[PDB]
Amino acid sequence: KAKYLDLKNFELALRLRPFTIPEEIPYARVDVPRVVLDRVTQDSSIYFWEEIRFREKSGVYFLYSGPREVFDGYIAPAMRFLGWGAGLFEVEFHEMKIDAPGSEYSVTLSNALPTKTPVLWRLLRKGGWSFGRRKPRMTFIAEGSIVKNDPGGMERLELGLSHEVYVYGLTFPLGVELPEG
Amino acid sequence: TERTLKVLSPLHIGTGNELTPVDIYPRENIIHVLDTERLVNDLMNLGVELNEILALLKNPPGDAYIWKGYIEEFHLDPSDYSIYTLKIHGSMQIKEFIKLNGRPYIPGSSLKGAIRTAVLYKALKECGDARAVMRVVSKVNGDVARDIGRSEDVLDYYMSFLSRARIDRKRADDLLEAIVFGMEPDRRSKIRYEPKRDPMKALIVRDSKPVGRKHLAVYHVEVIGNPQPIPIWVEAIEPGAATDVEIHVDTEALRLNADYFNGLLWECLKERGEPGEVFEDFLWEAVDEFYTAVMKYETIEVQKFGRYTSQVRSFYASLEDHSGHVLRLGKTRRLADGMPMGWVVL
Amino acid sequence: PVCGRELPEGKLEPSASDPETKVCPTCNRLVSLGGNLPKLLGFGRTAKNDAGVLVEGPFSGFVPYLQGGRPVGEQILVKNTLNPGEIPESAQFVPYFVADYFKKDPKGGVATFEELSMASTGTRRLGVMKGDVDRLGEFFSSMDSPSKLATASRFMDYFFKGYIGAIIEGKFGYIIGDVPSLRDWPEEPDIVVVYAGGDDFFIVGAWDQIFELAFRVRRAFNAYTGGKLTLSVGLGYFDERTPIYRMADVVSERLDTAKDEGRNRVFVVGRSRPLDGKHKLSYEWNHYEELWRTYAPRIYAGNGRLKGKLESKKGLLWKLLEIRELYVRDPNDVRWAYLTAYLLGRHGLSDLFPELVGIDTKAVERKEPQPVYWVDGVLKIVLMAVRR
Amino acid sequence: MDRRFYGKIVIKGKIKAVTGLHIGSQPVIKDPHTGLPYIPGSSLKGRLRSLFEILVNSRLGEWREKYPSLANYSPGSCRPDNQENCGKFFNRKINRGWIHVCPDYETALACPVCRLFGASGKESNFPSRIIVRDAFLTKEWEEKWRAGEAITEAKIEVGIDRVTSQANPRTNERVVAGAEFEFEIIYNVENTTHWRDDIKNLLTAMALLEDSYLGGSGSRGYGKVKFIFDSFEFRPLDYYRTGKDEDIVSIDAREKSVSDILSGFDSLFSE
Amino acid sequence: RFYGKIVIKGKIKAVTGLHIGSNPVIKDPHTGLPYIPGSSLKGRLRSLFEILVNSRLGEWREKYPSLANYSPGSCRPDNQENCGKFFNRKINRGWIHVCPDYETALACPVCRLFGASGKESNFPSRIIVRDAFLTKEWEEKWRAGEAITEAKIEVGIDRVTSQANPRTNERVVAGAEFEFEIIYNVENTTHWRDDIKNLLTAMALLEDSYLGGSGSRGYGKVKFIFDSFEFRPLDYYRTGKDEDIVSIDAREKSVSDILSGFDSLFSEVEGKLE
Amino acid sequence: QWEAIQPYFDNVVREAKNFLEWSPNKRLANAVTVAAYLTSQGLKTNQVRKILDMARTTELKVKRGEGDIKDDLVKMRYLLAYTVGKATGQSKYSLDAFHRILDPMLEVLMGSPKKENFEKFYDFLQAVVAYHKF
RNA sequence: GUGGAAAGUGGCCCGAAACCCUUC
């Protein structure tokens, strides 16, 4: 059940210290049995299409390690552009701090497409239609593994549209001292 | 089916939420029934309560004279707080007539009950023999029917079952009503009154129109069978307050669903042809038979009244000279000034 | 659409169904394997390019040894027996055990979900059970010989590969005894073992027998290890058209929640709970079997019919959940034990819930939840049993 | 096969019930917050539908070509033969009772009850074309309940049978005689020739409900609803798409004895 | 292009409650509250509008030119897709309207306001129906109890035995504002006026028909009291200190908002227009 | 049958007449015993049913009907003593046990208290009712 | 340049059947 941790149990979940797991996880992966209807008559057709569902005061966040000029020029206007119903969205910027020790080998914090450098990593498989024609499987490292033998795994160009879709996967470090391996 | 209900005798229909001596003020033999909510609401302001006085009604009852004439110390109105007035025929509690926004009316459930008793009477009378009862009781778990077959009529069967042992109320009350009006095989008494079998659901008895309050009064009651103190007074309708009523028959219920309806009334009314036609004549003639047989009991019960009074004789002389249907809404000694209680003609 | 193998080219071939949906060759072979799965006697491990090779492997293909054939690839994987019998003296007879039990249809083949949940005594819902043996990884860091490890693994695996078909078939009744009995345990149950092996076991079927199977498996396993080990079990009830991946991701989360919150506990039905860490979603087995010995024979008769007192007043137990929702929305208030008696006084049933009427100080002493929290897991399983 | 509506004639109700009203629940039926009496739509719709199909059960012998899909039935009852379809004008085992449901579309499209109260079953399930609003107590009686003068007075009956009358009583808590229930009723209008023989087919049922009861123990009172209409107006698609504050309004003088404003149905009407 | 995201924000009063089901119970996500799922609002809001244009297809026919090859009907008699009656899309039992190509569904007035898919079509729905979520009056009303749902029992009364049977429903309490919202993309500025007039037409088909489950016998009768028409043209995102339209709020009846104040509300948005 | 601890529990409620700022188990732990004495005597429901309707109507007047129960609380206070005066013989010997609680409660609780203050009394009013049957 | 794009948990259902607030 090692899924997610508090920050105070993350500055010392690395650096070889006895962290503690949390349990107040804001998930309701519920099984909403949606639509059944024909325009004239009955329809039976219970097709599920489950979704995620949150707590009373919770919400997603993500990070940004970059210069604030580039943030407020592209991403910060875009994070209020995003706000069938499941696009419910109100944006509130913030700052944060992480203790993050010496940078021999450390976390990626993203989904990751590495440059051939495997160190202790959950594998992922991410589809995505992305304007029509089905994107390939594009094997990924999951959220938070450790590839720090000088990463910089570039974004991958794809095919199918007029202008190319090119998929993310380039990562940013943190600080870990891992025991051995 | 608009019918007209004329009232022959004193008539009393009453809930049990009685009038209290905190409501009565007997004055000049005319009772002004008060409204104590408005009186309490207009006796604190520009008055007194001492934190207790208007809520001091754990005092003993009666004594209306002081209860107005000092609290109305030429300070309140005499009877503006009265909702209505009555007429004393005859200083304690009063049984209230069943009202509707302060207006008396005959409830149709009482009329339906006084008709259905007559329907039970003619159903046991003109069809109660063993060559009409056992033929139906054998169709519904006839272990009762072989006990019926020892007698030539179900009257002696129910006189047996009533005089049997283990008699409670819930099983022994409704059994004759079940045998007449339809039953169901259940493990309790080998039959059970499933009441949806009854053709009385094809009979509709509306509630009456509001009777006028100026023919509403309060009458004395004697019950001369015991030397117990009986200063009992009932709200009542004056004989002469001709009200209206609406009551009819659904032939479009029996005419469709004529198989599941069973029972001794249904068997006794299938005999007279189409049950849509003869049901109304059966209930009217059941009224005409039963409210004459009650007189037949009553014309020898005259010495059993206790008071051989000429009012009872002059009422019985007129009881069988009417152009409608006479009925009855409620030691046998209930009398209002000697007159009987609850006799109306329709 | 069938597999999540999810990267072929146009190699995928539509067959064995309505032939308009293109389908991977693995699941082309696999439904054909299922069509031989009742009559299958074993497999034969040969090279990948022989005759009759149904499935492949990393090194070797397999030939399905049916009831008459004679395959050979120098190894024969024979199912659920130790007598080789009618196989030649050239190949290596390799036995393997599989919990195989499944309800045959009128033909003899495997019943589907729609074929199974029609035999539900109550609502039409599919029961899904997913278990685990508890603290078993610590149990194999304590055996200090290859002999002890071999015995302690083989005796454990023989339960979840050979004993399961005995307990489903109705045996071991001399020690199982009074489990929660929703119905009569039939000759052929509506129980299909999907995957039982190693420690865990995953069994789908009709929920009225899934429920009895959970307690039968637990009490026979309590007999089988002599009480030194325990098993966790998640349970779930779904529609018959519910996808199997949600049907497993629900019971895996439920098994993990019953795993986290006491390690030896069943998850009978998903109940509402407050958020304070004092109300646990799971149930101890000595708690739940106690409760079903307490509240079920008072209010529930046998075979899908309610008790003669609650007969024709069958909307009574529904009102207790509406009562219990007040305790769910707040634990500190005290309206629940009052309105319970307000319900039970109106129907004359004075004695059927003596624990729910008076708030017990014994539970609020040691910060345990109130006795109306635990009874709804005994209510809803009766409420699913007599629903129409 | 088409729904194809253009229409929604509406009637604005006003059922001032006289001589009591007892609709039941778990006692009168106000579950929401403003404790009150109200008539919950479905108790009016079902009492309309069962009474109308009782009329059609006796009067099928003469329509019988008009509404042609009615001619697949008998005026009997499916009570003895306990099959879910028998060929009589009663089918559709709900749990133990029987209601009229045409299990097809095209047989329900012509049926004179089922074209106005909806089908169900295998693959068919006709939309009911009528919309029966929940009748809430009017603002006048709300203001006359805030000022005291209480509504929903109780009433006690007894079971005084023909035995020694130890009659166990039972309170009922009916609504007071005289209660404007602010009713509203909407009928979807589709394909005009299918229309004029529908609301004229509908009101007769309400006329029968004006003679019969609704709401509970109506064999001993508790009915007499008196649908004193208010609107009789019609809301075409010519302003649901473009709302210019215009409408085609009829007259609500007292009532109709038997369809006196049948001529005024088609006053400004083409759809 | 994109010059869009009109926000219709409002409150929907269920005058007789709702029964958006899932005993049948309402959708209750994580706190025990009920809510209108935005799926059901969009779905009923397209059924009413699709049957409106089913009646009205033969006469518009020049405006919205792609809605001319239909000639009304359902394709359930001739069991095939792409049959020119009005609507094919056989899902499992049902038949809904979706234009099977993008080039057609740039002009079908229902389909270009709730989208199209199938094979090689992929039209986005141009609308975002946010789920409505129990505005802060009835949230604080709920905190002291107040019983936000209501168990309501109906029966199937027979006529030959007059028996009955419990069919409980558990609907939402009659009278509850829900904090209703609508977000709409305003691509193709020449389409926009008729488009939001059509969305207001479909919303005006509500308040006179059933939302939410077992309607036509009660259980519907909703009312949109929508306050603030907004606009987010192209400067609310690159900036957002100021400069967006806020319309009149208080007593805007939707059967009167549709045009009797709409062109007095349209012309301010004509002031930006870009 | 009846024993003196039960009128002494009634006397704890009547002499400790203040329950308004007390614990929510001080209500329920006494309300059983109160009703126990109230079911040790007869106290059938239908004469108490006139009281409870005045509670529930004023409870709806609490639930956004007015500011408080100022004038209508008197008829709640009046009708108790009215039922006491109406009660005769086998009832006034018994019904005063229900009477001796609501008058000394509502004495100072006709201080025009808050709706949150009166709700703590209405919960006790409900709290007496079910243990008639239990 | 979003594991996407179109997808009302819907259709049908009287809380109904019977019951004198009255006797001793």
Ligand SMILES: Nc1ncnc2c1ncn2[C@@H]1O[C@H](COP(=O)(O)OP(=O)(O)OP(=O)(O)O)[C@@H](O)[C@H]1O
């Ligand atoms: N039949 C078996 N024979 C040998 N080893 C087994 C068997 N079943 C399970 N195991 C071992 O158990 C390990 C995982 O089991 P599991 O995680 O259930 O152990 P556990 O101690 O119960 O842990 P948890 O309580 O977290 O589930 C595997 O490494 C596997 O080798």
